[PDB]
């Protein structure tokens, strides 16, 4: 008994260990994206652009390898991966739990990242090289002057300064970026903690049995011997009776499918809208489920045989 | 890889002798502007500076102002000092200053590979509960009699009649340690399967916040002069460090800088133009990588003599090429396609396995 | 607009003499460089994720 | 001594078990070429034509 029980617990603890490893192995397998090529190599995470604009027209006309496949996907992706406005796109990313990515201008993106609730971030480098500029009527007097002015401002780092002023400084967040640093990246104390509480709980239970034990010793049971036999007999009888009640519980399983189905070993029932319930008295249940499951005969019904035997054994035991 | 001498350049002549990004960009510009051309290498081999004394322009920018050439197709930076003497088309390639470090992924055992799977915080609590049980058992069983017992319960602690009280304590404590050692084993297996090795963090701000990893730039150039004149918070501190850092954090040439990064085991970072950096990353032994975004916004352009006929045409040509994705295509051709290294391919390579001694050693000590 | 061949927005107000200069996040495109003049880029960008 | 030696062997046998699990996990990770697309997705195995 001690040997078989040992072999039993050996298998279980081995199973627990092995199983716990797959959940940790896969937990590491997870690799967030980072580049555009990552969006094409996978399909789990949907993605799209604005329904109208240079962004969408870019992929459509792009003859580049990666961007080509991306467009092919978005072109026939269902439901529509394209949004009406930029606000809708951001909202879709914030409500998809990371299942939807949105492609937009880096400038507007970087700004969004610095806005509450600070739940969005730009990943990887840009897909193409663009640039804004000061526009002046063809053949204007301000033409050359403004041109040089822009170059002068950039070299004085005044342009970079301005951007920092309205994008990062103006924030704000300014907090959601310091937490996005991506420091942590290991296991944790959480799971292990649950095992610590059950330990202290066991220690406390023992500290209670110690005092209790002492008290008992001091006291020193004979009363129970007389009324203990009667007590134990009626407890056994009560347990047996309830076991029989449990087996017949017109509810061994409920298979919701909104109707409502509940079954035991004898009846399969259904509650229709609204409230009316009907039952198909069949009595126990081996049927044509092609189960087998590879031997011959025994179940369904096998549970019937074990329950009936249990009650017969309990009756013989109660009597004796 | 803008303009290089072809393999058998000795057996070739004219424009066929050269190959590269700009060499292809030249043919494209010439096709949209409609003209024949003759690729020529600048004499002094410089870009475009202005000697303060003689007030003379040198390099390509020079050959343009003095009528030696009709157009300049090269990685010529669009600067204010040059825009005054010549004409720059719109940028055909935006760039900036980037950071270069050693090849990611390393090793190290330091019995500290055993405290990692199991967090330092967890090793602590498992020790607190350890003495927390040896003290509870100690209360189950005059001053020395308590010492001999505390040493006996500490031996009942150092792990391996029917006093129900302390009995369930030994059982629960056993179930507790069972879960932990199972967790350690499972977690360590995950580690031995994936085995991903991150690295530092991309952010010039990261170079200023720390000192363990030295860093510098070229002893002479716009890169160095950038930090010196930069009034930006982060870049300011960086310059202050490099300005008085000993030994010299500045290198003579770009090759020396790269060599310093490859021979410092990740203790030295080199700051250079993103363009040249990205290219280096695609060269054997593939032990360098660019981290974080650029520090500033620059851009190369096609230079044409002030008030030239090719002015407007070339300008539009550059814009046309970029919109057709032809520029991006060319870069991919000479940087990544023609490359030799690989990053997204090294992570896509699912293969590896072997036990060492490092981790196990920490448990021996 | 392809049909009317009319420019709209800021680029429009420039071509039709409504304004003297346009200071905004106006993208430097070939189609626009033909009708108006663009200074060097004061901010380089692109498409992101 | 018996306690520390026990903790020592505990770590080792745990390491052996974990590592051995990895040698079988990776052994399954390995996939063989099934189609042409497999030749393009990898580089370890060179290939060419006439
Ligand atoms: O010259 C142009 N400059 C633009 C500048 C910006 C912004 F980044 F917000 F400054 C944007 N947005 C990006 C995000 O979605 C909301 C608006 C659109 C622009 N468009 C329209 P396109 O035809 O879609 O490129 C232009 O034409
Ligand atoms: O017009 C210019 N074009 C340049 C183009 C390049 C390259 F990227 F290699 F094409 C470089 N390098 C970057 C890496 O270090 C080695 C040479 C320097 C350039 N410089 C000198 P700066 O004064 O330091 O900017 C110019 O003046």
From Swiss-Prot, chain D:
It is found in: Cell membrane; Postsynaptic cell membrane; Postsynaptic density membrane. Induction: Down-regulated in the pyramidal cell layer of CA1 in the hippocampus by global ischemia. The record marks 33 as: Crucial to convey clamshell closure to channel opening. Palmitoylated. Depalmitoylated upon L-glutamate stimulation. Ubiquitinated by RNF167, leading to its degradation. Detected in forebrain. Detected in dendrites of neuronal cells. Expressed in the pyramidal cell layers of CA1 and CA3 and in the granule cell layer of the dentate gyrus. The chain crosses the membrane at residues 1-16. Homotetramer or heterotetramer of pore-forming glutamate receptor subunits. Tetramers may be formed by the dimerization of dimers. May interact with MPP4. Forms a ternary complex with GRIP1 and CSPG4. Interacts with ATAD1 in an ATP-dependent manner. ATAD1-catalyzed ATP hydrolysis disrupts binding to ATAD1 and to GRIP1 and leads to AMPAR complex disassembly. Interacts with GRIP2. Interacts with GRIP1. Interacts with NSF via its C-terminus. Interacts with CACNG2, PICK1 and GRIP2. Interacts with GRIA1 and SYNDIG1. Part of a complex containing GRIA2, NSF and NAPA and/or NAPB. Ionotropic glutamate receptor that functions as a ligand-gated cation channel, gated by L-glutamate and glutamatergic agonists such as alpha-amino-3-hydroxy-5-methyl-4-isoxazolepropionic acid (AMPA), quisqualic acid, and kainic acid. L-glutamate acts as an excitatory neurotransmitter at many synapses in the central nervous system and plays an important role in fast excitatory synaptic transmission. The M4 transmembrane segment mediates tetramerization and is required for cell surface expression. Belongs to the glutamate-gated ion channel (TC 1.A.10.1) family. GRIA2 subfamily. This is Glutamate receptor 2. It comes from Rattus norvegicus (Rat).
